[PDB]
């Protein structure tokens, strides 16, 4: 609908380049606009995080040219095809994407990174419960070792 | 000030829809624009993370219509009213919000998710110190068990 | 190239203020646009996270005025000069920045916070492996204590 450095904007705003924000990024999290509010399983959140594969990579020059970014800057993230098998809520199909040389990539996948970070919050909550359980099992051994 | 798919933009940029970014999101973190720099308490950061409640939810169709998003896509996040009692720095009141049916929601709350993720970084730093303390208490038991 | 509340936009989009997004932020993580895909060392990711320094701070009024943000709102983040020594992939030099009083700050540093959060994901994966190793060493002590 509104594209910066680009034509064919599927989403409300598409930025072919970097975004520099002085303030913060806000999202509507008010309860009064929600429904089907169910509790998450933090144990399942830690499992999906531990299966995820983080990679160092760089963008192909043919893609970086048509996307307004640099191919020489190192990147660190995830593979959308691998995350889709683990957390498909964080992956979307955005149709075709044409590179700078004319190569058309059909069914190009994008990733909602904030969804992964939210999953990481629940993973920390699970780690907090596991370490607290380990400290209890450690405390029984220490009290048993001084008797 | 500048709104996409929307009127009444309270903030510098309001996007009623999704944002697709090819590059990265940058923030001004230079020291020379900061003051009142105080150390954080990672122990307090882990406590606020462990109290937070992650929920699976979906947006009401009346809200999703007036916000340029879909009601059928599953979501995972936080309740702004619940985070405000835990981390009020991450919650802001944005005034009134009118749904697609005319229902006016006064004192609508938004959430800065990056503030929660930053809090999660300090929670990991606290978990790193707790597990290192547990390994020391484990190491004393193992060396005591071989004597 | 496109600036909101600002002149001199170095990047594709610069927002002097806050950004309110109804939907999600998406990034191109498709494998077919990647190269030099190497595995990350989660042990190195936990080390860089544990060295990082989180601070509470507020923006100087002279900077907040020229950036479209408030100086009275509390902030929590990182020092770009300190992160650059730890994770230089997350820091960029954006040239000169002039405050509201005329003070020119040369070599102003910005931070990609999502790069830090991605690093935090690998830190959780390392904590998951350490706690699992501690539970094994605890389990040997418990089975040895009942013989």
Numbering used by the authors:
A (entry chain A), B (entry chain A), C (entry chain A): 559 to 705
Report text from the authors:
Myelin gene regulatory factor (MyRF), a novel membrane transcription factor expressed on the endoplasmic reticulum membrane, functions as a trimer. The trimerization of MyRF is associated with a fragment between the DNA binding domain and transmembrane domain that shares homology with the triple-β-helix and intramolecular chaperone autocleavage (ICA) domain of phage tailspike proteins. MyRF is expressed in oligodendrocytes as a key transcription factor in the formation and maintenance of myelination in the central nervous system 11. The MyRF ICA domain with its upstream β-helical stalk seems to have a similar function for driving MyRF to form a homotrimer and release its N-terminal fragments as a free transcription factor from the ER membrane by self-proteolysis.
Here, we present the crystal structure of the MyRF ICA domain with its upstream β-helical stalk, determined at 2.4Å resolution. To gain insight into the folding process of the homotrimer and the details of the autoproteolytic cleavage reaction of MyRF, a precleavaged protein was generated by expressing a noncleavable mutant of the fragment (MyRFS587A) based on previous reports. Unexpectedly, the protein was split into two fragments at the front of the autocleavage site during crystallization, resulting in the production of DBD crystals and the stalk-ICA domain crystals. The space group was P321 (a = 78.7 Å, b =78.7 Å, c = 138.5 Å, α=90.0º, β=90.0º, and γ=120.0º) and each asymmetric unit contained three monomers, which belonged to three different homotrimers. The overall structure of the trimer showed a drumstick-like outline with the stalk sitting on top of the trimer connecting the DBD and ICA domain. Each ICA monomer displayed an α1-β1-α2-β2-α3-β3-β3a-β3b-β4-α4 fold architecture. The C terminal α helix (α4) of each subunit of the trimer wrapped into left-handed superhelix and created a cylinder that was approximately 27 Å wide and 51 Å long. A “cable” from the neighboring subunit threaded through the middle hole of the “donut”, and the cleavage site was located directly on this “cable”. Additionally, our findings showed that MyRF was cleaved via a highly conserved serine-lysine catalytic dyad mechanism and that cleavage would be activated only if the ICA domains were organized as trimers. In contrast to the viral ICA domain, almost no interaction was found between the MyRF ICA domain and its upstream neighboring β-helix of the stalk; thus, activation of self-cleavage may not be triggered by the upstream region of the ICA domain, contrary to the observations made in phages.
